[PDB]
Design an enzyme around this catalytic site. Sequence first.
Site, PDB file in Angstrom:
ATOM      1  N   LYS A 123       0.719  -1.281   0.019  1.00 51.86           N
ATOM      2  CA  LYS A 123       0.146   0.054   0.035  1.00 51.86           C
ATOM      3  C   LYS A 123       0.866   1.173  -0.024  1.00 51.86           C
ATOM      4  O   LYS A 123       0.318   2.408  -0.287  1.00 51.86           O
ATOM      5  CB  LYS A 123      -0.962  -0.086   1.208  1.00 51.86           C
ATOM      6  CG  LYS A 123      -2.186  -1.112   0.757  1.00 51.86           C
ATOM      7  CD  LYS A 123      -2.721  -1.367   2.356  1.00 51.86           C
ATOM      8  CE  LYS A 123      -4.211  -0.898   2.367  1.00 51.86           C
ATOM      9  NZ  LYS A 123      -4.919  -1.284   3.291  1.00 51.86           N
ATOM     10  N   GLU A 206      -1.858   7.672   7.730  1.00 53.29           N
ATOM     11  CA  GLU A 206      -2.446   8.576   6.919  1.00 53.29           C
ATOM     12  C   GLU A 206      -2.950   9.199   7.875  1.00 53.29           C
ATOM     13  O   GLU A 206      -3.592   9.006   8.904  1.00 53.29           O
ATOM     14  CB  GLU A 206      -3.356   7.518   6.233  1.00 53.29           C
ATOM     15  CG  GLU A 206      -2.973   7.527   4.694  1.00 53.29           C
ATOM     16  CD  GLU A 206      -4.025   6.561   3.912  1.00 53.29           C
ATOM     17  OE1 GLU A 206      -5.045   6.113   4.645  1.00 53.29           O
ATOM     18  OE2 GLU A 206      -3.767   5.982   2.730  1.00 53.29           O
ATOM     19  N   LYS A 243     -16.563  -4.697   5.301  1.00 51.65           N
ATOM     20  CA  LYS A 243     -17.705  -4.514   4.563  1.00 51.65           C
ATOM     21  C   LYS A 243     -18.956  -5.418   4.791  1.00 51.65           C
ATOM     22  O   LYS A 243     -18.518  -6.501   5.262  1.00 51.65           O
ATOM     23  CB  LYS A 243     -17.433  -4.745   3.095  1.00 51.65           C
ATOM     24  CG  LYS A 243     -16.316  -3.614   2.579  1.00 51.65           C
ATOM     25  CD  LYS A 243     -15.678  -4.039   1.196  1.00 51.65           C
ATOM     26  CE  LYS A 243     -14.821  -3.108   0.718  1.00 51.65           C
ATOM     27  NZ  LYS A 243     -14.136  -3.250  -0.651  1.00 51.65           N
TER      28      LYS A 243
HETATM   29  N1  LIG Z   1      -7.416   6.857   6.171  1.00 56.01           N
HETATM   30  C1  LIG Z   1      -8.484   6.347   6.522  1.00 56.01           C
HETATM   31  N2  LIG Z   1      -9.408   7.448   7.163  1.00 56.01           N
HETATM   32  C2  LIG Z   1     -10.926   6.553   7.491  1.00 56.01           C
HETATM   33  N3  LIG Z   1     -10.950   5.540   7.343  1.00 56.01           N
HETATM   34  C3  LIG Z   1     -10.361   4.620   6.652  1.00 56.01           C
HETATM   35  C4  LIG Z   1      -8.934   5.118   6.284  1.00 56.01           C
HETATM   36  N4  LIG Z   1      -8.116   3.949   5.612  1.00 56.01           N
HETATM   37  C5  LIG Z   1      -9.037   2.945   5.946  1.00 56.01           C
HETATM   38  N5  LIG Z   1     -10.274   3.412   6.305  1.00 56.01           N
HETATM   39  C6  LIG Z   1     -11.324   2.545   6.590  1.00 56.01           C
HETATM   40  O1  LIG Z   1     -11.191   1.211   6.627  1.00 56.01           O
HETATM   41  C7  LIG Z   1     -11.619   0.556   5.559  1.00 56.01           C
HETATM   42  C8  LIG Z   1     -10.947  -0.356   4.615  1.00 56.01           C
HETATM   43  O2  LIG Z   1      -9.865   0.297   4.189  1.00 56.01           O
HETATM   44  P1  LIG Z   1      -8.596  -0.308   3.275  1.00 56.01           P
HETATM   45  O3  LIG Z   1      -7.439   0.563   3.279  1.00 56.01           O
HETATM   46  O4  LIG Z   1      -9.032  -0.520   1.911  1.00 56.01           O
HETATM   47  O5  LIG Z   1      -8.208  -1.491   4.313  1.00 56.01           O
HETATM   48  P2  LIG Z   1      -8.599  -3.074   3.666  1.00 56.01           P
HETATM   49  O6  LIG Z   1      -7.083  -3.534   3.545  1.00 56.01           O
HETATM   50  O7  LIG Z   1      -9.207  -3.442   5.242  1.00 56.01           O
HETATM   51  O8  LIG Z   1      -9.760  -3.019   2.721  1.00 56.01           O
HETATM   52  C9  LIG Z   1     -12.151   1.754   4.583  1.00 56.01           C
HETATM   53  O9  LIG Z   1     -13.536   1.539   3.595  1.00 56.01           O
HETATM   54  C10 LIG Z   1     -12.634   2.876   5.645  1.00 56.01           C
HETATM   55  O10 LIG Z   1     -13.801   2.405   6.269  1.00 56.01           O
HETATM   56 MG   LIG Z   2      -9.522  -2.285   1.173  1.00 53.53          MG
END
Ligand SMILES: Nc1ncnc2c1ncn2[C@@H]1O[C@H](COP(=O)(O)OP(=O)(O)O)[C@@H](O)[C@H]1O
Ligand SMILES: [Mg+2]
Lengths: 408, 655, 163, 81
Positions: A123, A206, A243
């Site tokens: 990532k 982040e 999700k």
């Molecule tokens: N910087 C962020 N700020 C707020 N929520 C986040 C952030 N990063 C991830 N999330 C939350 O976590 C969920 C999954 O994010 P993601 O980075 O795609 O992790 P995963 O690998 O679990 O899919 C997002 O849909 C959001 O709800």
């Molecule tokens: Mg994701």
Amino acid sequence: LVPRGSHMKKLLVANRGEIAVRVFRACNELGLSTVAVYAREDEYSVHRFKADESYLIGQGKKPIDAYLDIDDIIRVALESGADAIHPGYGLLSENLEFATKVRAAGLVFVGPELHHLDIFGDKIKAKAAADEAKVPGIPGTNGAVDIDGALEFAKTYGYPVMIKAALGGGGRGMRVARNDAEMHDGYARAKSEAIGAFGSGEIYVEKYIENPKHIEVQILGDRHGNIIHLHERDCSVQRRNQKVIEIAPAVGLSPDFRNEICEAAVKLCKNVGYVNAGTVEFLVKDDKFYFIEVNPRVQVEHTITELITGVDIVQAQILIAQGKDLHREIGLPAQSEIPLLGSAIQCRITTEDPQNGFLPDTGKIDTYRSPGGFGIRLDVGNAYAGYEVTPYFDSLLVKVCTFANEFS
Amino acid sequence: DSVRKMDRVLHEFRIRGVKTNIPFLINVIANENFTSGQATTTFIDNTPSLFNFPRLRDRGTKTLHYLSMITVNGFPGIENTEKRHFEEPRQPLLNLEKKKTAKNILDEQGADAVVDYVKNTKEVLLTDTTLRDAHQSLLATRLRLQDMKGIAQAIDQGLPELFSAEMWGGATFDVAYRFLNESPWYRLRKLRKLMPNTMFQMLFRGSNAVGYQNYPDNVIEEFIRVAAHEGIDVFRIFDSLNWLPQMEKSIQAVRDNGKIAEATICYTGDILDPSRPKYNIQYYKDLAKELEATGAHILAVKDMAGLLKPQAAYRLISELKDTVDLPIHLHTHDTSGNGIITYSGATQAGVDIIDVATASLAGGTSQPSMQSIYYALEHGPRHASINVKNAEQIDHYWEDVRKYYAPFEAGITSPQTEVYMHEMPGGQYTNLKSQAAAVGLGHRFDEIKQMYRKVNMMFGDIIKVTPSSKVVGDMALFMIQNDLTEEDVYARGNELNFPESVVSFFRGDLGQPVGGFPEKLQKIIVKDKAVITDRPGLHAEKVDFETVKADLEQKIGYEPGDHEVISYIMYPQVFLDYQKMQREFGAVTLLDTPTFLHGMRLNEKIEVQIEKGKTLSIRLDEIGEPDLAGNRVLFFNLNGQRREVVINDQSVQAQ
Amino acid sequence: HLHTHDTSGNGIITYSGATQAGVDIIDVATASLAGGTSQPSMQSIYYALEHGPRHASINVKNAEQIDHYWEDVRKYYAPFEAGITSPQTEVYMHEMPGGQYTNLKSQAAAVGLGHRFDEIKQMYRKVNMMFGDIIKVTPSSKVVGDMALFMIQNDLTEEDVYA
Amino acid sequence: VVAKRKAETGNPNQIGATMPGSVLEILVKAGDKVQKGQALMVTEAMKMETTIEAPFDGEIVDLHVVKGEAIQTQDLLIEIN
Ligand SMILES: Nc1ncnc2c1ncn2[C@@H]1O[C@H](COP(=O)(O)OP(=O)(O)O)[C@@H](O)[C@H]1O
Ligand SMILES: [Mg+2]
Ligand SMILES: Nc1ncnc2c1ncn2[C@@H]1O[C@@H]2COP(=O)(O)O[C@H]3[C@@H](O)[C@H](n4cnc5c(N)ncnc54)O[C@@H]3COP(=O)(O)O[C@H]2[C@H]1O
Ligand SMILES: [Mn+2]
């Protein structure tokens, strides 16, 4: 440029459950014969009996380790005479080592190029690639950091912040820190899970966005420079950042805005020459959007996109891996002509007990009656009368999608 | 794509308990009238090809029928008992050495080059009889392919030093079909692939191959051609009366097919007993010279009853080595407890190859132990050529596998020196035991062994190996059963009906024995039946392979391979009965042995590998009680489906 | 007076060798209770020597007749049979007398190591060397067994013990 | 009530009743040699008539029904070898 050995007669799915059954169905519709793999403990899985042939793997190992047994899965592919491996989602589907070895064994890996698994599996590298393509991202640490670079970030940008693992998936390598004390604690615990679950523990941070929507764009790219998007999905309905319910298209957002999101995803995928199916995930807040991830594989929610576009995504994946042109051979229209029909919703029905902290139940299924009708799609996992739900794998029984002209 | 999806869906449905129209729908959407979109209201009514429905295969169900049969009614001819929990057999931990083997030499340079390799070897070489003679002696030949496959690769890789593995012929051909419901040809192919560097050896009767009818020469020649093509490398050719004409054509055909021929001398009597000069050392030398002149590659000495004592082995081998230049391959049984010492004696005399079994299937009426002879020679002037540590590891697997065959054990494995008195080879001893039982003389068996010995002398003192050993048995039994002395037979034989096998012997149907027949007794026995004095196969009803092939195809409903044709010729009724059993029960060869023999226990789960990539996961959930007509209902789980199986309980029916 | 067991399958040939060397008396069992971990066969050794320079002193026909009784009586003891009576040359590696072999089998079972017995035979051999290379007969054979068992069950290499 | 012997499941030597009804006529007897397709007996179900055919060549072993006897599904009609 099409790789040598792209012609297929037999395909093997390095996975289990609903996604394996989903891939077998596509294969059969394409005239390909299929091969399943199963761990001993998973020997009553539907996917085992849907393939034209099946083989036990991972003898003597724990069941999840069996599905991660790269060499043994390759052994089966070679012994059975398979041409291709579809990795499904989860498990080894984003794993660079696995794809490398599959390709090194002369097999087709139904997925993007090794280079894409490398930059989108990580990532940090993915945010780098998104910046390079001029796709707005979330302010974050320049690369990976120790706790001092993390604290530095929080000083620069402020709390709250999201601590994230370079190889996080499903939501296991991530923590919100609203504090110094939560930064020390959260960082420690995100690093543990990242080593424990995925074997390495590199961490970046982040900016944490407040009450965002999660909007993601489905992409297909072929080996002839064609890239297209199949509109987007709204996956904001989550529990603990996992999700639960997904819809398509994003009906609560304006079509101009959704289109802008789709074009940003396409721009990124064009910039790196993305091949096969993939998804670009964005967080959305007040008519701005921010890149967070690419999943360089099919996803569990691809179903709802198939329903609103008429495009069979898994068939497409397989045909792309055979070297075919999206437009010329597979028959997808030009981007402006991709259908947008109605809306669709997907729920996953699981044994998670909501009155017992969502702890998934185990035991024997006495009764399983599945509904049907107009606007209903079912993609079953392991659920049938008699089936014993074990504690070893996920708790999914069946994925239900509905589709209709109107969202209501 | 809509059509493809329909087709996928129709094939994916699983509906059991009622018939459906699915096979008709499948035909309709396959047709070009439908896929073009041009069908009319009269299309179906005018297309009779839509009503041809394939027969859909059901291996699952034949399996459940077999499991239910054995579980409820037992395995025929053994005690219907409850199945023990067996661990997996141990696999060996090998230390591999890569070497060129005799098989490699046969394939790259031919037979005479193998013979040269043998002559230049200082060590005594070994043939493993574990896959043939050892279980023929100890387990009524019941050892199954399924057990053989699990260790075959280990033997090939593990013990490259072996001259050969004896894995076919003798009783295995017949028993495989008739009692194990598996094909000996499938055994040969399957092992052939797992053991590409090991010479495969068979025992072959010169005039009959593996059968007991009178076959014409072209049959014998064709058997050899197919066996050779299918992977038999060494043919040990013998005749029950050491009658050379019975062996000549076979030897020539093996040579013509590019394989190795051992010409055999069957040992009997005692070269060191000057009171039995008929089978003296000169007899053996004379016959060895004639065998050498046939062009045989190797001379085998077959001591089928284990009579050879170590000083005689020494004298016999040393003399033979000064009489012919062929390597000598000696085969004995450990029935007297003198097998190792006899082999060790023979080693000092120059013997080139010996037949040994793995320890856990050695001793008693089997061959002497392979591992034991290694250690008996380890500090002598000539060693045995084998990887003994590997052999010991592999023995573990056979030690575990042997336990599955408990119901077929002949008795305790120990010495029996009375073999020197009666000279029965082992099968003749056990069989003759069953026969005396079936006629209520089990209690007089010792009088029978005594009579067997008298009969042998009465018949002129003969070589007793299958089928001549049976001739002697049947007679001895007959004579006790009807209270007859030798005097009685000479006095009132003219009014007695002698056993079939005896009559056939004295008509010359087994060939000519050494020193001819006793004349008066011959007349008495044969009375008015036809007597021949030449080779029986000269009188054999002619056989046309095209005719027989067409006859057979008609009978089994598909085109038989050359191997099936020859099986049918060898054993016609048995081959047809095997086909019926395949049709009722399917490929039982694929079942693990304890399941094959005992079926399943309540709540037991088994995995049957029915093909590469296909496994039947079978669980027995309920064994219903029989109703008054014998009906029992068993409930299985098969690959996640409940299956209800009705079997008839024979015990109730025979109440 | 020489006494051996036929465990390796070399008992008769050993007794015969010993006969040429002047041995005065040998220990043999009747055929039906001979071979395997028992003594070599009385009836067999007669016939191994019959045509040699030195014979065995026995009424072999009588011995054969008497063996019939033992063959029949042995069947009554089926439930106590240690397993199939056949050779086992690994005795040269571990040197357990027969009772020590069967007993040490029960003990590994009672502690749930029946499945690692071949590691145990290997450890029995190492222990023996560890103790200076010793004579193993009852009860010294048990000393070696208990230790080898202990060492596997607590996962200890020789050094662990030293360390 | 002494139950009728049932045809063994998956045993193609045994022909069992496919539906309830009765036996109109018996065309063959114990010992007879017979050919694939040859008619062995006729049965009725709802007064529809079915002819029981030999599944392959072989020899009739025994009958297990009599003329005009009533039959239930799975009832054993005839055995073949
Ligand atoms: N910087 C962020 N700020 C707020 N929520 C986040 C952030 N990063 C991830 N999330 C939350 O976590 C969920 C999954 O994010 P993601 O980075 O795609 O992790 P995963 O690998 O679990 O899919 C997002 O849909 C959001 O709800
Ligand atoms: Mg994701
Ligand atoms: N001087 C010595 N030094 C070391 N070890 C000795 C030995 N003399 C004998 N042995 C051992 O005893 C075994 C049996 O000897 P034996 O003469 O009793 O029993 C002999 C004998 O019965 C027979 N045999 C061997 N050579 C013979 C001969 N030259 N003439 C007649 N018979 C012979 O074969 C049997 C096995 O003899 P093999 O020589 O293989 O095996 C010998 C050998 O291992
Ligand atoms: Mn033999």
